């Protein structure tokens, strides 16, 4: 049987940080949408970051860019005293963070995340609840570069109760696995199972319009027992699809990243897998930088190698490089596309974990997928958003120049 | 508990087709032909005979030529006609042809027992197996059908194992599953009859005496519908062997393909998988070579490719692929279906497999194939020798890299 339906009207808006300077021939930017989710908090907010460097003196920098970071820290300080019980979740760091001091003396609560002494991994998700209506599910870092100085990509749900709580649920898992003396038990509390999961999908109504809409979550150790993996929900989507699959994600590395190393075919025997027996068309757009890993490069050549005419396979794998100039290059870690997506003829998939086997394995990440019978939707304004960075002059082939790439690109 | 320990004075020897006009330097240790060991064991034959063949091509005839190059092969097939007659018990079991052999025919009113199997419609494959067991005592596993080409026009690789009759009995067990199912109202049990079991496999490979030292040597079989309970699959054994090289892998098939060749197209990363981990988890190197001719798969350039991309410095993974080719001049071109690498073994630094089968889904999966596996804490012996053999291929001036032209190769060669 089905789970109840939800009747709340959400609605979805695709969000992008586009980094200063670059042009393209739009969605609403990161900080208006956490600015305006900030003005409209009124009962609680849950945040579930990766790390805080809000301000200059955070980054050690003084670039006018960190204005609107600046901002929505100070938004952040406002929601306490007014009324709205916030609650942040962030992983270990190594030294205690002024922005996280300043909120809990704001009235804000704060707890740490060891998922290193749990799991082996860290706390890289980052989305917000907000008054357990709306959401927001993205890339963007508590960060005041992801806000103008780094490309990322993220959803924001509006007046969707129902998601909002199985969101919160997720959220809830992570603050109980803040406090002190505090383990993964055996079998979670009742009070975290969901109905909700790729064999039964939460039925909302996006923008007027019936879908199916759920919320996977990763390590499998933080997973209830009615919550699909964020694995499994990767590669039902991966393996449903029958026309193509645009993937834009920073890293894609089918091992795993840090262990002694272990081989993890998954992701990369499925898009196999989709190019061969179904002819479906993969593109695979990857981040690179002056930080990316080398070891990509291979792997990353052991997929173009697929495209053939005689197996009638079309995998095409393309470079997204952040233009850089003098100025830009000063400020430190910034210029990336930092996006985690993929979309189908059919299907859309927002994730917060690079393609790697540790973010789905020992390290924490959320994941939204969205199905709907429309002519288009979410889905389609993915795949606009795919096609304008995949034609944009940003993205380069596996055997261009490095030099005329505007920016370090180690894989180049 | 491991099962009894073998006593038998086995005696392994390589057996080799070389095409003829292919030439190699001084020493390049020569091992004797297969022609020699097929004459000697029909010869020494005295018993009972099994044989499990693919198609039966032996004399000029069959094939529409007149080249004496076939002597070799109608002269064995001269010997088979001799063991019924003089109280060898000879049985048979062929892959289901389209139309009447005649090798079958002149066989049987020899004297001898033929059956074919039809695996396509048991299992959707074919009768792939190529292998001897005579007497009980001795018995060849290879990739030489029984044709004559394969004799002198074709590559062959295969092992001769002499004096080891607990092998051969194990071998027969394979060869009973066969003849059984040659028969008309016969079909794949759900469980195999106790007699079809084995009590040697990879987990208790069976203890012989190799060249005068213990060794562990064990058979398998594909595929698994065709496999007793106790019955290590083709696959297994091969994934096994990958897995457990710490230094070295070296593949010589004529084809590798990770997919299903004929069928719904499937994919089957299973042996890519284990190759790439090998590669990267334990940094292990990887040699392909893949034999060429105007007859392969052109779907199987661009898999390779994929293969040798993971060539990097950066994982420290090291994949190389070569293509082999036998060259072919204006007379030896006439010759249908030869001037080819059969080859179909894996030798690492720890451990020997030589099977019967290319290296594709359909025979693991539905195709029926036997490998023998062989491990020995020596300082040569078999696996030396089959590295050897795949170090003078590999380095003779018959292999090529996956960029080379066609123009310069000497053959037909469709993935270059
Ligand atoms: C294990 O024992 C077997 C049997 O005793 C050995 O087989 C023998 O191997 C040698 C060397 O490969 C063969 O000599 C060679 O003969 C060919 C012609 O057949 C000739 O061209 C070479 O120059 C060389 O003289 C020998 O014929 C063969 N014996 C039989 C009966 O076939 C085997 O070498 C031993 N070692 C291993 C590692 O198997
Ligand atoms: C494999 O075994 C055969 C015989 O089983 C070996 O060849 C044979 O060697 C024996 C000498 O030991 C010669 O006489 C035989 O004596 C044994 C007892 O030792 C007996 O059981 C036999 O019935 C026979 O009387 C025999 O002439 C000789 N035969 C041949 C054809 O060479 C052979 O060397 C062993 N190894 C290989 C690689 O074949
Ligand atoms: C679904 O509804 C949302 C909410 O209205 C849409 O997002 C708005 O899009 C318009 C442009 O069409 C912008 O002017 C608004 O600023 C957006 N809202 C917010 C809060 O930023 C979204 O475009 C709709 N999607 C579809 C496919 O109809
Ligand atoms: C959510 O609901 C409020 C009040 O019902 C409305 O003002 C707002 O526009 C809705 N959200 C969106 C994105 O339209
Ligand atoms: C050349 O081949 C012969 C015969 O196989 C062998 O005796 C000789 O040792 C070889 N030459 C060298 C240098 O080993």
Redesign the interface.
């Known amino acids: 049987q089905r789970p109840a339906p939800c009747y709340d009207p959400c609605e979805a808006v695709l969000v992008e940080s586009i980094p200063e300077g670059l042009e393209f021939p739009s969605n609403p930017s990161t900080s208006q949408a956490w600015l305006g989710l900030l003005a409209g908090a009124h009962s609680s907010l849950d945040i579930a970051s990766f790390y805080w460097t809000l301000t200059n003196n955070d980054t050690h920098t003084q670039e006018p860019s960190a204005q609107q970071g600046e901002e929505v820290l100070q938004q952040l300080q406002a929601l306490a005293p007014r009324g709205v019980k916030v609650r942040i979740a962030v992983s270990k760091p190594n030294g205690p963070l002024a922005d996280l001091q300043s909120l809990l003396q704001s009235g804000a609560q704060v707890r740490m995340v060891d998922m290193q002494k749990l799991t082996h991994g860290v706390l890289h998700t980052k989305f917000w609840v907000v008054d357990q209506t709306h959401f927001y599910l993205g890339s963007a870092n508590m960060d005041w570069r992801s806000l103008t100085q780094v490309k990322e990509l993220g959803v924001v749900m509006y007046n969707c109760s129902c998601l909002a709580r199985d969101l919160t649920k997720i959220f809830e898992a992570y603050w109980f696995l803040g406090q002190a003396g505090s383990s993964i038990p055996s079998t979670w509390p009742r009070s975290f199972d969901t109905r909700y999961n790729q064999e039964t999908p939460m039925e909302i109504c996006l923008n007027g319009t019936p879908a199916l809409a759920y919320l996977a979550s990763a390590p499998p150790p933080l997973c209830p027992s009615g919550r699909t993996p964020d694995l499994k929900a990767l590669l039902n989507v991966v393996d449903s699809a029958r026309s193509f699959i645009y993937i834009a994600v920073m890293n894609y590395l089918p ?1 795993m990243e840090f262990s ?4 993890w ?1 998954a992701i990369d ?1 499925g898009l ?2 989709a190019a ?2 179904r002819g479906v068309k993969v593109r695979l757009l990857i981040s690179c930088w002056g930080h990316s ?3 990509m ?3 990353l ?8 005419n ?2 009638h ?1 079309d995998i095409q794998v393309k470079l997204f490089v952040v233009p850089t100039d003098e100025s830009q290059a000063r400020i430190p870690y910034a210029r990336v596309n930092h996006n985690k997506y993929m979309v189908t003829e059919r299907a859309s998939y927002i994730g917060t974990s690079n393609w790697s086997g540790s973010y789905f394995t020992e390290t924490a990440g959320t994941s939204l997928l969205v199905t709907q019978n429309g002519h288009g939707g979410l889905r389609s304004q993915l795949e606009a958003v795919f096609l304008r960075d995949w034609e944009s002059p940003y993205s380069h082939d596996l055997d261009t120049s490095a030099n005329s790439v505007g920016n370090a690109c180690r894989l180049l």
């Open positions: 091992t002694p190393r272990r081989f075919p025997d196999r897998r061969y027996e890993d080398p070891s490069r291979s792997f050549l052991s997929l173009a190698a697929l495209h053939d005689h197996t396979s």
